[PDB]
Amino acid sequence: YEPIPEEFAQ
Amino acid sequence: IVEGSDAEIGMSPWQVMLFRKSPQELLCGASLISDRWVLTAAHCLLYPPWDKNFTENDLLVRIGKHSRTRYERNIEKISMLEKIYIHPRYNWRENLDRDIALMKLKKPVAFSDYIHPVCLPDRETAASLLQAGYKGRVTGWGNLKETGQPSVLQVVNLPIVERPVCKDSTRIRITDNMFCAGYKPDEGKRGDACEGDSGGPFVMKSPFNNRWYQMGIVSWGEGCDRDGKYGFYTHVFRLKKWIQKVIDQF
Amino acid sequence: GSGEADCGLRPLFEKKSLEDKTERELLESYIDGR
Ligand SMILES: Cn1c(CNC(=O)c2cccn2C(=O)[C@@H](CC2CCCCC2)NCC(=O)O)ccc1C(=N)N
Numbered sequence: 001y002e003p004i005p006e007e008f009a010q
Numbered sequence: 011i012v013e014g015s016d017a018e019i020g021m022s023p024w025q026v027m028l029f030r031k032s033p034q035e036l037l038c039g040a041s042l043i044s045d046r047w048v049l050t051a052a053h054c055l056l057y058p059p060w061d062k063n064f065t066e067n068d069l070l071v072r073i074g075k076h077s078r079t080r081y082e083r084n085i086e087k088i089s090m091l092e093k094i095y096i097h098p099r100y101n102w103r104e105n106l107d108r109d110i111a112l113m114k115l116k117k118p119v120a121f122s123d124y125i126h127p128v129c130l131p132d133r134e135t136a137a138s139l140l141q142a143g144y145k146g147r148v149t150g151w152g153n154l155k156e157t158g159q160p161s162v163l164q165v166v167n168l169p170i171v172e173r174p175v176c177k178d179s180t181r182i183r184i185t186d187n188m189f190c191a192g193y194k195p196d197e198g199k200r201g202d203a204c205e206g207d208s209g210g211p212f213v214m215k216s217p218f219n220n221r222w223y224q225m226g227i228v229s230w231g232e233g234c235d236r237d238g239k240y241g242f243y244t245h246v247f248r249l250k251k252w253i254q255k256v257i258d259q260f
Numbered sequence: 261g262s263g264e265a266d267c268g269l270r271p272l273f274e275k276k277s278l279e280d281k282t283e284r285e286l287l288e289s290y291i292d293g294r
Pocket of ligand 1: 053057104105106182202204205206208228229230231232234235240241242
């Protein structure tokens, strides 16, 4: 899988 | 999905992907029923036998996708869970009875050409469509064979099967809160859901008003697309009252 | 109704009166055939 933006890791 | 095919763009605007934060991986399928709620299978969140027991902060919800692994920038929408609700009488111990769960999204999701909710059935619709022989549609990014997987969302159209035939095909104690689908050995056509498709939607289009209704939830099977075996789905309507209850209260 | 007013109508299909590649297999089965 292609990494997802960290702004959605909370 | 086994023996299915590549879904077309916007074909299943309600299809949701349950995504695990760490490691980042496909967890399950799910469906959008409004802007704040997505419906899925309980075993996706809780399943002691396999030490499965996720919580709100462990997951991410991805809506509007087509591709399985790419971050479809500007198209897909990633959302956080605020609350998970597992049916109180979900039986993971014996036969996965009442395999259903509701997830409350932290922030409402804005609809688009690739993001749109599916209708939940009413007593009449369910009564007219949920009949043996009537075909339904299943979608998911799960495995393509029992034991490489899809690059793009997959879909199959399967017929609902007579309750008696479902029972005589397994030793698992079937209940009223579940139905089965798939072709019979001589019917020539085949296909089934499979690992990775769990929590996904089983839908039908109403010939009366042309809307799509989710009648079932991808739940369990024995192997994938085996002759003589069928996929089992959670009977959405039978649990519709638990669903409504949850939403107005919370 | 028992599903908010706009549910079940896809933007790229029902709303533009376009059908998908296999939806007809479904309807063909909602009465007498299989
Ligand atoms: C829906 N499906 C799945 C996903 N379900 C699941 O993964 C489900 C959750 C936990 C076990 N499960 C299973 O389906 C198990 C059967 C399960 C029934 C209830 C008691 C415990 C066993 N089958 C696995 C196998 O035979 O290989 C795999 C294959 C299908 C299908 N035939 N369409």
